[PDB]
Ligand binder design. Structure first.
Ligand SMILES: CCCC/N=C1\SC[C@@H]2[C@H](O)[C@H](O)[C@@H](O)CN12
Ligand SMILES: CCCC/N=C1\SC[C@@H]2[C@H](O)[C@H](O)[C@@H](O)CN12
Ligand SMILES: *[C@@H]1O[C@H](CO)[C@@H](O)[C@H](O)[C@H]1NC(C)=O
Ligand SMILES: *[C@@H]1O[C@H](CO)[C@@H](O)[C@H](O)[C@H]1NC(C)=O
Ligand SMILES: *[C@@H]1O[C@H](CO)[C@@H](O)[C@H](O)[C@H]1NC(C)=O
Ligand SMILES: *[C@@H]1O[C@H](CO)[C@@H](O)[C@H](O)[C@H]1NC(C)=O
Ligand SMILES: *[C@@H]1O[C@H](CO)[C@@H](O)[C@H](O)[C@H]1NC(C)=O
Ligand SMILES: *[C@@H]1O[C@H](CO)[C@@H](O)[C@H](O)[C@H]1NC(C)=O
Ligand SMILES: *[C@@H]1O[C@H](CO)[C@@H](O)[C@H](O)[C@H]1NC(C)=O
Ligand SMILES: *[C@@H]1O[C@H](CO)[C@@H](O)[C@H](O)[C@H]1NC(C)=O
Ligand SMILES: [Cl-]
Ligand SMILES: [Cl-]
Lengths: 603, 605
């Protein structure tokens, strides 16, 4: 009965045999707690959007081969039924690579167990993994297709493949074939590339509808001329019309002026194109989900993206401006719009040192260490995210400062160094490849190595983390390593088994109570770390992401109220990696602050 | 052993043998929805108060004799446990008369079934009923007494008795005897009166600790000296230190400056005096609970009182300044203060007229009317609050306007008049006792009479309501009356029988529905409803009577709507009973509407 298709006559979509144009906003269910899905979707519907667009991050659902996460916050099918229920159509972007400022562009790290794998190509081991994944994901998506009573109207194949070096058309044909096998022959399949013949050359394929992306700085006539070169008939489509842009730690927060977004949007819409706003809400890279660009620069925890809905889902000026623009082409729904959530400043919460990482290896590594003559990568020791401790012992005496070095810039991505429990400093990928250490002969040399996010774009998406090449001490190669994978998540959640200048990396814990019986508490809040330097934060064992007040521009992290409790005290755990304000006699300096406003744009 | 006593040697209270003085705030549980009890008491705790004071309005708990309300919003026992769980002490004021700008000063209207009753006196019928109420309420309060493990440290007997004319000391001794009977010999019993010998004269009694009240305009030294005259030894106590004042419809909203309150509080506390702030939160007079003053002037729906916590419980600047003053004397609790609740503007909701009151008689009055030669009062027809319809026929032709009058000024308190379904205007207690009417001989004369609130202070608390004396037409007494007491609360919850039982316009019901989405964490929120183009009436949402609106007079324009009576997915039904003029006649539906705004307007122009 229900039909969605391209008609090449009036250069648009037909939905059930009538002209249709979509006005869509991106929302990534993996960046919004499920608790807030309906709030974010309804606020989108109230803006006049007739569709949403989302990415399926493969690594978010298949963290090990044959092990799947489809429940609760990982419940993509529920997210799509929710959008359908609210009268929203869906543009589905299942990858397998999605880019998206997300860890390894969505590709699982365990693909790198074949060290020579060519990602995003007809590499047969890559293809076999993708097919297995498609064979799990696509049967789930099939009943959600418009034609089968669901909201899914079009499906993107890959993501900006014309920007990748490999240019493997056999790979794209494999995807087309497999998508067609699981989804049937009616579903509209499409690609998205940069709006210029140089990008379309390797991205476009026969039988996949070619669409472009571009933001407020591109000539709109030209951008659409580049799409029409590939598709002379059918809908003009901008699949990613930038409402804002991404951040990197240590760089200024990106913003795009409302007026530019509204002007461009009106223009796109008036030509009768379908369009998706990237992002409409950005949300947050919780835990270790953020990505990175080459040359190595990680994106921060916040994925606010200067979107119309702020990271916490607030209604912004930009929100109402775009709504006003869409009102010129559609009647938007009636009624008042769900509000920006109330925010509460819980104030200062004092922390106490629980344990250094060194002192906690029993619980961080219950299996015992892996021993190896040379250093092993994260992939080889079977850890994907977080931190691995690399231990050796000095061979020569170092009373005088000896150079500890990764000659091949093989510290991926940052390493916190200690000799016999004296902090020595930091090795930084691309930036600091040498550091002067001291200690006795037979001293324990510790390098705590952080994966700061796998690169999500470009040639270097095969980003093994860890010590990926040798380290040398006074030009001599350090050998005889004792490598500890670290179950930081497990250990924080069990209060490190205790259930019932630099400083050494350590866990700091405190807590705070919220009164019950109060109809408006708990509320959303923002955590601040003044005096801290770099680390990871959990509240009630929930990993809220990374803090780095030392680099900016993000100083506060979003804390959604639903992980806060009133029946029992809430516990905050910080893993500070470089310097904690906690030696002081004054214990009041060893503390975090909850504030009612975000600071993601610090100078 | 748990003890709380007056230390007469040391001019002080002893709590478990230690010196104690209290810094209390008034909160009336009958004026805050239960949903928000814990919110207000925690805000009051976080202010630095170590006690709260509250009244028990008898009529709130015994609407008819031997028929009690002690559950939910009427659950005083629970309110007190909640104050105790928060570590607050409680100063209980159970009347039996409480004043409090509350209908009849808390006295049940049914006491008036004896027309000649002398209230607040040793009149034997008033005593019997008081005694019966104390036998119900006081045994419930006994285990909440500090000595028995609860929060209650002192208990007020009567309320400003010294201001009342009767000066019946036997009455006071009767109360003391019965309070002692149910509560025991250790409870601290006390009285409150104006800070001046002319009030303390009839208020004070041996055995009851004498305390005073006074506000920011009183001389603190003179006030405490009047107290010391009755009580030479023991703690100084201002039982009602006014942080603001009451309103009346038609008068500007009363405010008292934060500075004057702060500096008076400082000085009271510098004396080592115990003090209670009246009000700390004021809340709302829902339904028909408001009182009035003589000469007749009703207090409005809002009981904001310019309190440190606003009507809807907001922290105000006054709150912070008062918290700061207390901090100078006492350590105040640590941690963040629960916030002002989020308010939400639901916007315009259109209503439409469902039925005039005239057309809804059968559902409003299902047992039928009472027939009487001359008019009967609300009490005689067994209705205490709301509206009573009086009906007769014109005994003569009035094709030329003829005067309808209540020569003895006996329309209590407002009558909405119609002849054969044509509205004629309004009769008003004091202001307008005559109204010109037209109609044919034998036409139906209707007077919809509103009880605007029984006087809560003065000699005139025996306020019957209704047509309390005869009407004349062209000077001749009108006879043969058909009187319909109106069951408006029931009729509204059944949607005028629609849902079954599992210039002027005719008084009429207007209804309209609005939805709020489910699965949104922060919806529904508190709101405020406004009535642009409407005149005077009653409003319900989901059958919860939010009180009276009178935007024609002010100063209150909005009414407070607590979030917990609002529902998701299921439509919320607004019912408006407009009494004088509805904006609903033109061919513009969008005029027939109300608006929900996110800020209160109780203090305008
Ligand atoms: C020249 C920049 C091209 C890199 N592409 C980007 S950076 C921001 C966005 C998101 O990553 C999105 O997932 C990409 O499709 C397009 N894009
Ligand atoms: C000037 C006459 C004073 C009448 N008493 C009042 S008006 C405000 C307050 C409350 O009504 C309160 O219930 C009374 O005790 C004292 N009082
Ligand atoms: C866009 O480019 C076209 C040429 O294709 C040109 O005619 C037009 O002026 C340009 N518009 C803007 C906004 O620069
Ligand atoms: C190590 O020490 C040598 C000699 O003291 C010095 O030249 C060098 O700068 C040091 N390492 C670094 C960080 O450059
Ligand atoms: C380290 O050096 C040894 C010996 O030269 C070599 O076998 C090994 O491959 C090197 N490892 C890395 C990661 O460079
Ligand atoms: C937080 O928890 C610790 C230990 O569980 C406890 O000592 C403290 O009272 C709690 N609240 C704080 C830190 O104020
Ligand atoms: C209050 O009255 C006393 C007399 O009892 C007087 O000494 C004092 O000056 C007065 N204070 C004020 C503020 O008027
Ligand atoms: C009633 O009408 C008479 C004229 O018959 C007039 O004198 C009088 O002022 C009117 N009274 C009122 C209350 O309008
Ligand atoms: C009504 O008038 C009659 C006759 O004067 C009188 O007996 C009676 O008391 C009056 N009733 C009222 C309620 O005024
Ligand atoms: C008002 O809502 C009630 C309850 O659902 C219903 O009985 C009535 O018919 C509704 N009217 C409108 C216009 O929605
Ligand atoms: Cl997307
Ligand atoms: Cl009180």
């Amino acid at each position: 009965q229900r039909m969605f298709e391209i008609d090449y006559s009036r250069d648009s979509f037909l939905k059930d045999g009538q002209p249709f144009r979509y006005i869509s906003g991106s929302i990534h269910y993996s960046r919004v707690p499920r608790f807030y899905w309906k709030d974010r979707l309804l606020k989108m519907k109230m803006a006049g959007l007739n569709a949403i667009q989302t990415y399926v991050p493969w690594n978010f659902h298949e963290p090990w081969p044959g092990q799947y996460q489809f429940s609760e916050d990982h419940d993509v099918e529920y997210f799509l039924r929710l959008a359908h229920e609210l009268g929203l159509l869906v543009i589905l972007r299942p990858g397998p690579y999605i880019c998206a400022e997300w860890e390894m562009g969505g590709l699982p790290a365990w693909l790198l167990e074949k060290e020579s794998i060519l990602l995003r190509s007809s590499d047969p081991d890559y293809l076999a993994a993708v097919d297995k994944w498609l064979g799990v994901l696509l049967p789930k998506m099939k009943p959600l297709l418009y034609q089968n009573g669901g909201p899914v109207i079009t499906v993107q194949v890959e993501n900006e493949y014309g920007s990748y070096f490999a240019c493997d058309f056999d790979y794209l044909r494999f995807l087309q074939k497999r998508f067609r096998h699981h989804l049937g022959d009616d579903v509209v399949l499409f690609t998205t590339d940069g709006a210029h013949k140089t990008f379309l050359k390797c991205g476009a394929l026969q039988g996949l509808y070619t669409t472009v992306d571009f933001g407020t700085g591109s000539n709109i006539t030209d951008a659409f001329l580049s799409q029409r070169k590939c598709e002379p008939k059918g809908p003009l489509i901008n699949s990613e019309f930038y409402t804002g842009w991404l951040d990197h730690w240590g760089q200024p927060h990106s913003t795009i002026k409302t007026e530019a977004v509204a002007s461009s949007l009106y223009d796109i819409l008036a030509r009768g194109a379908s369009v998706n706003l990237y992002m409409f809400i950005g949300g947050t890279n919780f835990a270790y989900w953020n990505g990175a660009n080459s040359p190595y620069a990680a994106q921060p925890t916040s994925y606010d993206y200067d979107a119309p809905l702020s990271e916490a889902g607030d209604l912004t000026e930009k929100y109402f401006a775009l709504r006003n623009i869409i009102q010129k082409f559609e009647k938007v729904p009636e009624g008042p719009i769900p509000p920006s959530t109330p925010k509460f400043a819980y104030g200062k919460v004092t922390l106490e040192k629980l344990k250094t990482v060194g002192a906690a290896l029993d619980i961080l590594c219950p299996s015992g260490p892996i021993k190896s003559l040379y250093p092993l990568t994260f992939i080889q020791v079977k850890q994907h995210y977080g931190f691995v401790l690399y231990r050796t012992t000095l061979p020569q005496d170092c009373s005088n400062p000896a150079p500890l070095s990764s000659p091949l810039n093989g510290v991926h991505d940052r390493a916190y160094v200690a000799v016999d429990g004296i902090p020595q400093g930091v090795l930084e990928r691309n930036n600091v490849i040498t550091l002067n250490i001291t200690g006795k002969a037979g001293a324990t040399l510790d390098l705590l190595v952080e994966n700061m996010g796998r690169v999500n774009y470009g040639a270097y998406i095969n980003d093994f983390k860890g010590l990926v090449s040798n380290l040398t001490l006074s030009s001599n190669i350090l050998t005889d390593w004792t490598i500890f994978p670290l179950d930081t998540e497990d250990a924080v959640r069990s209060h490190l088994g205790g259930w019932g200048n630099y400083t050494l990396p350590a866990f700091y814990m405190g807590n705070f109570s919220i009164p019950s019986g109060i109809p408006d508490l708990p509320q959303d809040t923002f955590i601040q770390f003044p005096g801290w330097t770099k680390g990871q934060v959990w509240i009630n064992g929930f990993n809220l992401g990374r803090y780095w007040p030392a680099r900016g521009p993000q100083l506060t992290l979003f804390v959604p109220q639903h992980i806060l409790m009133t029946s029992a005290p809430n516990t905050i755990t910080v893993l500070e990696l470089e310097w904690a304000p906690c030696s002081s006699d004054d214990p009041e300096l060893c503390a975090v602050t909850f504030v009612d406003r975000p600071v993601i744009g610090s100078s």
